[PDB]
Homo-oligomer: A and B are copies of this chain.
């Protein structure tokens, strides 16, 4: 049944989003960490009956059937913003102002 196979994808998408949120919350106190946001994107649609035009001035609704398929997680993008600075007073701690990475 298509309904089960669609709701399964919905539940999986929600589960992955919850995992992303949990990972973001878990290491909140780590230094130099950038949050993540997961973006979803719907799957392709199947057209069963082509919406044949009428143009008969009957003001009738379009008669076309198009079934969806479900949802998938497409990407997880991290926001590279400048976080706050916390002072450790240690002589060997360096904080970057702007953009760049150590190698």
Report A's interface with B, CB cutoff 8 A. Answer: 2-3, 6-7, 9-10, 13-15, 17-19, 21-23, 25-31, 33, 37, 39-42, 48, 50, 73-74, 88, 90
Q: A28 — which chain B residues lie within 8 A by C-beta?
A: 10
- What number of copies of this chain does the assembly contain? 4
Are B42 and A27 within 8 A (Cβ)?
yes
| Contact partner, A29, options B2, B3, B40, B50, Cβ 8 Å | B40
Contacting residues, chain B, for A73 (C-beta < 8 A): 48
Are B19 and A2 in contact, CB atoms less than 8 angstroms apart?
yes
The smallest beta-carbon distance between A18 and chain B, in angstroms, is 5
The 9 closest A-B pairs by CB, nearest first: A10-B26, A3-B22, A6-B22, A3-B18, A27-B42, A6-B26, A2-B19, A30-B40, A3-B19
